[PDB]
Design an enzyme around this catalytic site. Structure first.
Site, PDB file in Angstrom:
ATOM      1  N   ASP A 168      -8.291  -9.643   7.253  1.00  0.00           N
ATOM      2  CA  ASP A 168      -6.842  -9.683   7.036  1.00  0.00           C
ATOM      3  C   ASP A 168      -6.012  -9.837   8.323  1.00  0.00           C
ATOM      4  O   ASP A 168      -4.940  -9.255   8.456  1.00  0.00           O
ATOM      5  CB  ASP A 168      -6.407  -8.456   6.239  1.00  0.00           C
ATOM      6  CG  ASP A 168      -5.035  -8.614   5.648  1.00  0.00           C
ATOM      7  OD1 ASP A 168      -4.630  -9.775   5.395  1.00  0.00           O
ATOM      8  OD2 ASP A 168      -4.355  -7.581   5.446  1.00  0.00           O
TER       9      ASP A 168
ATOM     10  N   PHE B  66       0.780  -1.246   0.000  1.00  0.00           N
ATOM     11  CA  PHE B  66       0.000   0.000   0.000  1.00  0.00           C
ATOM     12  C   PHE B  66       0.816   1.302   0.000  1.00  0.00           C
ATOM     13  O   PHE B  66       0.375   2.300  -0.550  1.00  0.00           O
ATOM     14  CB  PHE B  66      -0.932   0.008   1.218  1.00  0.00           C
ATOM     15  CG  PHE B  66      -0.200   0.006   2.541  1.00  0.00           C
ATOM     16  CD1 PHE B  66       0.134   1.207   3.172  1.00  0.00           C
ATOM     17  CD2 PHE B  66       0.164  -1.198   3.153  1.00  0.00           C
ATOM     18  CE1 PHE B  66       0.823   1.213   4.389  1.00  0.00           C
ATOM     19  CE2 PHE B  66       0.847  -1.205   4.375  1.00  0.00           C
ATOM     20  CZ  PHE B  66       1.178   0.005   4.993  1.00  0.00           C
TER      21      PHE B  66
HETATM   22  O1  LIG Z   1      -2.326  -0.081   8.980  1.00  0.00           O
HETATM   23  C1  LIG Z   1      -2.527   0.208  10.154  1.00  0.00           C
HETATM   24  O2  LIG Z   1      -3.763   0.163  10.671  1.00  0.00           O
HETATM   25  C2  LIG Z   1      -1.384   0.526  11.095  1.00  0.00           C
HETATM   26  C3  LIG Z   1      -1.600   1.345  12.223  1.00  0.00           C
HETATM   27  C4  LIG Z   1      -0.549   1.617  13.116  1.00  0.00           C
HETATM   28  C5  LIG Z   1       0.748   1.067  12.922  1.00  0.00           C
HETATM   29  C6  LIG Z   1       0.929   0.247  11.785  1.00  0.00           C
HETATM   30  C7  LIG Z   1      -0.114  -0.025  10.890  1.00  0.00           C
HETATM   31  N1  LIG Z   1       2.125  -0.325  11.515  1.00  0.00           N
HETATM   32  C8  LIG Z   1       3.213  -0.145  12.305  1.00  0.00           C
HETATM   33  N2  LIG Z   1       4.385  -0.757  11.961  1.00  0.00           N
HETATM   34  C9  LIG Z   1       4.647  -1.438  10.809  1.00  0.00           C
HETATM   35  C10 LIG Z   1       5.418  -2.617  10.860  1.00  0.00           C
HETATM   36  C11 LIG Z   1       5.725  -3.332   9.691  1.00  0.00           C
HETATM   37  C12 LIG Z   1       5.254  -2.880   8.451  1.00  0.00           C
HETATM   38  C13 LIG Z   1       4.481  -1.706   8.390  1.00  0.00           C
HETATM   39 CL1  LIG Z   1       3.865  -1.108   6.856  1.00  0.00          CL
HETATM   40  C14 LIG Z   1       4.190  -0.997   9.559  1.00  0.00           C
HETATM   41  C15 LIG Z   1       3.109   0.669  13.450  1.00  0.00           C
HETATM   42  C16 LIG Z   1       4.216   0.882  14.293  1.00  0.00           C
HETATM   43  C17 LIG Z   1       4.099   1.688  15.435  1.00  0.00           C
HETATM   44  N3  LIG Z   1       2.914   2.259  15.736  1.00  0.00           N
HETATM   45  C18 LIG Z   1       1.838   2.063  14.947  1.00  0.00           C
HETATM   46  C19 LIG Z   1       1.872   1.279  13.768  1.00  0.00           C
END
Ligand SMILES: O=C(O)c1ccc2c(c1)nc(Nc1cccc(Cl)c1)c1ccncc12
Length: 348
Positions: A149, A33
């Site tokens: 998912d 995304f």
């Molecule tokens: O999509 C959401 O709802 C979403 C919402 C919050 C976080 C997230 C994804 N992804 C995080 N980390 C992350 C770890 C690995 C890959 C990716 Cl793309 C993202 C992350 C880290 C720290 N605080 C909040 C988030």
């Protein structure tokens, strides 16, 4: 002034600002995304936030719009923030990229595992995490919503600070997370009852038989996913390490026993069966991998003790082939498995 690239990605790095408000201070991850960044929010006292930035591409910016609406409604239906879904504080359109501001949390459950050399979480941790997942999703289900998912990558630790213990029996170090409190993330596939249901949902490893067979899916989909996840927390490796439908089904049979016949009769994917029996080549690499690697579910237990027997019982119920027969999350929270929780864990 504001630059992009090939698939859309915003050209940004630590130092850059969005809306003259969000100051990027680090990277948290990237994906199909787009990107997720850590920011300071200068309009809220330099609040630490995780800012999700969808790519400047029609159908992505588009799908994000519905993701926000799902988040608006989660926010709107849980004002006390007690049901453990990732909290959206803000959303906005930046020159084509839909950005969603979230509370900042620690590592996701997959990344913690990877950094722990894929060594499993202790059963008490598996127990407490299981309990939060059931609570969160029961709440989502209660509200005409299906995630679709769920996977370890989408489950985040509030705080992932760990202790290091030496494991006597393994002769190596293990990381043990200090707080097993979690949040359910990534609602960009979540679906309302009255909305259109795409035929195929879920990441393959976590995708249920009713979806492969194309029999339609509801909330029980999320329950199948959770079974898969609990196994993965318990063993440290993927339950269905699969890339293909046929193989996936064969793996389900080797692990869970034969597909119920009423489902074989209802499906229009008859290319998989032959006299009610699954058709596959056992001498191909896929066939040999499955033969070598996939054993009955119970053979994966690490200990005989009651709490291990109880987890494996809940797990089998979560992994029932027939979705109508599949345990609900309300029934899951009543299982004698969660009698092992501490009052601090149990009370939320
Ligand atoms: O999509 C959401 O709802 C979403 C919402 C919050 C976080 C997230 C994804 N992804 C995080 N980390 C992350 C770890 C690995 C890959 C990716 Cl793309 C993202 C992350 C880290 C720290 N605080 C909040 C988030």
């Amino acid at each position: 002034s504001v630059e992009d690239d090939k698939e859309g990605h915003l050209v940004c790095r630590i130092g850059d600002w969005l809306q003259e408000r969000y100051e990027i201070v680090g990277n948290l991850g990237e994906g199909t995304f787009g990107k997720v960044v850590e920011c300071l929010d200068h309009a809220r006292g330099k609040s630490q936030v995780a800012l999700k930035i969808i790519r400047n591409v029609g159908k992505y910016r588009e799908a994000a719009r519905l993701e926000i609406n799902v988040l608006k409604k989660i926010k709107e239906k849980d004002k006390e923030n007690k049901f453990l879904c990732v909290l959206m504080s803000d959303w906005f359109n930046f020159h084509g990229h839909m950005c969603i501001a979230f509370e900042l949390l620690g590592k996701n459950t997959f990344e913690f595992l990877k950094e722990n050399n894929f060594q499993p979480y202790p059963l008490p941790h598996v127990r407490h995490m299981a309990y939060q997942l059931c609570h969160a999703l029961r709440f989502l289900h209660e509200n005409q919503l299906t995630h679709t998912d769920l996977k370890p990558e989408n489950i985040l630790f509030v705080n992932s600070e760990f202790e290091t213990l030496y494991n006597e029996h393994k002769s190596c170090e293990e990381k043990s997370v200090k707080n097993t409190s979690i949040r359910v993330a990534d609602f960009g596939s979540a679906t309302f009852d009255h909305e259109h249901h795409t035929t195929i949902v879920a990441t393959r490893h976590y995708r249920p038989p009713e979806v492969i067979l194309e029999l339609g899916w509801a909330q029980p989909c999320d329950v199948w996913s959770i079974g898969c996840i609990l196994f993965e927390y318990y063993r440290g490796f993927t339950l269905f390490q699969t890339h293909e439908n046929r193989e996936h089904l064969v793996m389900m049979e080797k692990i869970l026993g034969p597909i119920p016949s009423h489902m074989i009769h209802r499906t229009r994917k008859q290319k998989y069966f032959y006299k009610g029996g699954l058709v596959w080549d056992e001498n191909s690499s896929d066939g040999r991998y499955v033969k070598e690697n996939c054993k009955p579910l119970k053979s994966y237990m690490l200990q005989d003790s009651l709490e291990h027997v109880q987890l494996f019982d809940l797990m089998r119920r979560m992994l029932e082939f027939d979705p109508a027969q599949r345990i609900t999350l309300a029934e899951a929270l009543l299982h004698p498995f969660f009698a092992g929780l501490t009052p601090e864990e149990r009370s939320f």
